[PDB]
Design a protein around this ligand. Structure first.
Ligand SMILES: O=c1ccn([C@@H]2O[C@H](COP(=O)(O)OP(=O)(O)OP(=O)(O)O)[C@@H](O)[C@H]2O)c(=O)[nH]1
Ligand SMILES: O=c1ccn([C@@H]2O[C@H](COP(=O)(O)OP(=O)(O)OP(=O)(O)O)[C@@H](O)[C@H]2O)c(=O)[nH]1
Ligand SMILES: [Mg+2]
Ligand SMILES: [Mg+2]
Lengths: 227, 226
C-alpha cells in the first residue's frame, strides 16, 4: 500500500486540521497524491467541518468522512446526545484502508487528542493507527503546558509501538516570547519539529497558504514520506 | 510512615493547590495530621506561593519547600532564566520521606502536569512518587479536552506502577453546562471522583473553606487515607 499518517495532537483546537491542509498542500506540490480522512466529526450543528476546511485551504479533493454529530462535544457524548452510535473500530479501519494506495499520502485527523474515544468500547485513534500500521504526527502548541502534554502523548504512542513522525507547532506567534521560545527549544529536544505554521494560517488564501505550506515543511522530509 | 499522596493534575492552573488545601482541611477536621510539600515554587516575582495559599485556607503549618524562582515559568526554564539549577532528586525525595511519619497525611505538589521537569536532571513528580512509594491524586477540569488529558495522565501513572488515589475536579462550574455535566459522568466511568470543588473556592475565608472542604469529600474515604 502507501503511507498512512494519523495527525493527532495534544488536545482539541491545537491546529490538527490546519496542519493536515498544510502537509497535504506541501506534499501535493512535491508530486505526492494526497487523501485526507476525518472518520469522526463533531459539532456540525455549529458548522464544524474539518474535511471541508482542508479542501478549502489546500484544494485536496480526496476527502473521506464517516460519522457526523451535531453537538460540539466529545464524540461519545455528541453521539449519545443525538440518539446515534459511534462507528465500530473496523468501520474506521476500513474507511482508511480503502484510501491507502502506493505513492499516496493518506492523512487521518482524529477528534480532539490521542485518547479520545472514537469507537466503542474505548477505541482510540491510537488503536486505529496500530491496525493500519500508521505513524503519528503530533500537533502541539507553543503555550505553557505544551511540554507535559507532548511528552504524555509521545509516551502514549510508544506504549503501543506507534511510531512518532514528529511534531508540528500548529500556531506560531510573530514574534514569540520567553515561554514560547523555551517551549520550542525544549520540544525540539525530545522530538523532531517538522513545522511551525504562522498563526492565522487558517485565514490565508490559496497562494499564501501554498506558499506558507511549502516553506513550512522541509521538502525533503515530505517527499521522503512516501516512496 | 504514614500516607504520602502526590497531588498532580492534567496541566497548569487546574487547582492542585486548592485541592491540596481542601483535602488537608478535610483531613485536619478528621483529626489527621497533615503536611504539604511544594519542593519547587516559581513565579515568586508576581507573588505566587502555593504553600502560603495552603497555610491560609487550610491551617497547615508543616509546609516544606526547597527552591523558589522569580520567573512565572516551568521550573527548568525559570532555573535557566536565573542562571541556577533545579534542586536534586535526592533532596526532594529525602525532604518528603523526612516529612512522612505515621498518623500523618503528607501531600506533595509538583508544578503543572505530571511530566514537567522538577529536579536535575529531567526528573519529574512521577519519579518522586516512585521513589517515595506515593499514590497520586489527579486534579482535573470538567472542560472540553479533560478526558484525553485525564486518560493520558492515568496511563503514565500506571506505566510506572504509581497507584491512582482518584480524581478531583479542581473547579466545578455554576451552573454546569452540558459539556461539564457530561464530562463529570464520563470521568466517574474512568476513576473515582473524590470531590468537585465549587468554582471560586480559592477565595473563601478559612472558616468558609473548611466548611466547604468537609462537605466536598467523603468522610470514610478521607479517614481511610491514614
Ligand atoms: O474561539 C475560538 C477562536 C478560534 N478558533 C479557531 O480554531 C482554529 C484553529 O483550530 P484547528 O481546528 O485547526 O485545531 P484542531 O484541528 O486540532 O481542532 P479539532 O478537530 O480538535 O476541533 C483557528 O482558526 C482559530 O481561529 C476556535 O476554534 N475557537
Ligand atoms: O486567566 C487566567 C489565567 C491564569 N490564571 C492563573 O492560573 C491559575 C489557576 O489555578 P491554580 O494555579 O491555582 O492551580 P494549580 O495549583 O494546579 O497551578 P500551579 O501550581 O501548577 O501553578 C492561578 O495561578 C491563576 O492565578 C488566572 O487566574 N487567570
Ligand atoms: Mg480540527
Ligand atoms: Mg499551584
Amino acid at each position: 500500500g502507501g503511507t498512512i499518517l494519523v495527525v493527532t495532537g495534544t488536545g482539541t483546537g491545537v491546529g490538527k486540521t490546519v496542519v493536515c491542509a498544510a502537509l497535504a498542500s506541501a506534499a501535493r506540490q512535491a508530486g505526492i497524491d494526497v487523501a485526507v480522512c476525518k472518520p469522526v466529526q463533531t459539532g456540525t450543528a455549529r458548522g464544524d467541518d474539518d474535511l471541508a476546511e482542508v479542501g478549502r485551504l489546500a484544494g485536496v479533493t480526496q476527502l473521506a468522512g464517516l460519522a457526523r454529530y451535531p453537538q460540539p462535544m466529545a464524540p461519545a457524548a455528541a453521539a449519545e446526545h443525538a440518539g446515534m452510535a459511534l462507528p465500530a473500530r473496523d468501520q474506521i479501519v476500513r474507511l482508511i484502508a480503502d484510501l491507502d494506495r502506493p505513492g499516496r499520502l493518506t492523512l487521518v485527523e482524529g477528534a480532539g487528542g490521542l485518547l479520545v474515544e472514537l469507537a466503542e468500547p474505548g477505541v482510540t485513534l491510537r488503536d486505529v493507527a496500530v491496525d493500519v500500521a500508521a505513524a503519528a504526527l503530533v500537533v502541539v502548541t507553543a503555550d505553557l503546558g505544551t511540554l507535559n502534554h507532548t511528552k504524555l502523548t509521545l509516551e502514549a504512542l510508544a506504549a503501543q509501538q506507534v511510531s512518532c513522525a514528529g511534531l508540528v507547532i500548529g500556531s506560531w506567534p510573530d514574534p514569540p516570547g520567553l515561554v514560547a521560545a523555551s517551549n520550542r527549544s525544549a520540544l525540539a529536544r525530545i522530538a523532531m519539529v517538522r513545522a511551525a505554521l504562522p498563526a492565522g494560517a487558517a485565514s490565508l488564501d490559496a497562494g499564501d497558504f501554498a506558499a506558507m505550506s511549502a516553506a513550512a515543511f522541509d521538502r525533503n522530509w515530505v517527499a521522503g514520506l512516501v516512496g
